[PDB]
């Protein structure tokens with residue numbers, strides 16, 4: 001009853017152009033079986049959303065990568081939030097929610113905005129730039145490590161560690177095994193910075209440690225929660241901002257609408273997250289035999305959710321393949337959905353908003369003027385290089 005497909009969603013062919021294969025996956029049925037990796041797949045919005053919103057049946061504690069923690073050793077100690085189920089999930093989630101709250105956003109907004117304005121001003125002096133290295137990477141590197149309260153030394157390890165984390169959610173292909181074999185220095189750096197004495201007062205890291213006396217988390221849990229922000233908090237935003245700039249470069253009409261109303265910046269970033277979905281795929285593991293879209297899935301089975309596909313499903317979205325900065329984006333799953341829905345989403349949106357605001361007010365045109373190069377990662381979608389010419393407004 002379940003169709004079997006030979007599509008490898010972790011192949012370079014797929015990463016290069018995933019959209020046709022995603023339609024094939026959606027149109028094959030609500031649930032498919034991927035023979036390449038012996039996992040179930042769901043690529044339609046309705047089933048992805050259903051799976052995300054049933055954490056009892058579709059759990060995270062057995063890993064959200066291909067590997068089943070009940071069968072294999074996790075490459076690093078499990079995340080206390082991403083790779084936990086309720087009730088263990090609930091208090092660490094509450095702490096990170098309070099750390100990355102509205103009040104915190106109010107304390108960092110002016111600084112994030114100033115840095116975004118300054119970066120765009122710098123880039124306009126250069127005119128011809130790489131929108132990845134010089135903007136999508138450079139801007140979050142100029143604000144997030146500082147907001148964490150990291151020392152200056154060693155920050156070159158942050159993006160490699162993130163690449164490793166997102167590759168490690170994948171199957172044991174070359175991308176994954178190469179990342180892990182090179183991992184030791186990046187892990188050593190990240191783990192050390194997670195300790196209380198290495199995190200500057202007033203930062204996100206110190207704030208997590210400060211919550212260790214409320215009864216929500218203990219002191220021994222705090223380093224792993226800092227590790228969650230150092231895993232998830234930088235490379236995601238790099239690919240989100242890169243997505244938005246790439247979208248504005250490819251859809252000049254939308255850049256012109258954004259210029260005419262810079263208060264569209266937050267939605268323009270949100271629509272970039274829907275349209276490119278920086279985080280493409282994640283797994284769950286079934287805790288029982290379950291019926292999903294008329295198909296029966298056995299206990300202890302890995303289920304691959306195609307978030308990018310769900311965000312392009314014409315069953316849910318009108319003109320899904322258009323970038324539309326006045327689209328009603330609510331309901332997209334680019335930040336997940338349900339109890340694990342991105343706890344850093346206010347930081348992500350703040351970065352994206354103030355950068356797109358700066359572009360809207362300072363830039364008249366973004367023209368690609370060189371070869372675009374894609375970055376291949378088992379979980380992350382984005383570019384390696386995006387040469388553009390920026391015309392000042």
Ligand code: HEM
Nearest residue numbers: 081082232233236237240334335336340342343344347348
């Ligand atoms: C555009 C940028 C981002 C995207 C697309 C993104 C995407 C996601 C998604 C899809 C999930 C759900 C995972 C799941 O259901 O298993 C998630 C969770 C999470 N994200 Fe984000 N994220 C972004 C930025 C950030 C930032 C900036 C931070 C931290 C400062 C962050 C920290 C986390 C953490 C800690 C979780 C786990 C939450 C939980 O399990 O309850 N993310 N993110």
Ligand SMILES: CC(C)c1ccc(C(=O)O)cc1
Nearest residue numbers: 079081082227228231232236
């Ligand atoms: C979903 C993605 C952004 C993510 C990656 C790692 C962690 C963690 O290490 O807890 C959390 C979320």
Ligand SMILES: [Cl-]
Nearest residue numbers: 076187190191
């Ligand atoms: Cl680690």
